[PDB]
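Hi R.,

As promised on Friday, here is the backbone we talked about, encoded as structure tokens. Could you run it through your design pipeline when you get a chance and send me back a sequence?
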């Protein structure tokens, strides 16, 4: 979820989470 990745600074900070979160 791109919008969810860019939603949470904590998540976006870690590529693995933006990989995890589609």
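Update: got your reply. Pasting your designed sequence below so it's all in one thread:
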């Amino acid at each position: 979820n791109p919008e969810d990745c860019r939603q949470d600074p904590e998540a976006n900070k870690s590529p693995e989470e933006c990989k995890k979160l589609k």
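One thing I noticed while checking it: Helices lie at 2-5, 9-12, 15-20.

Thanks again,
M.
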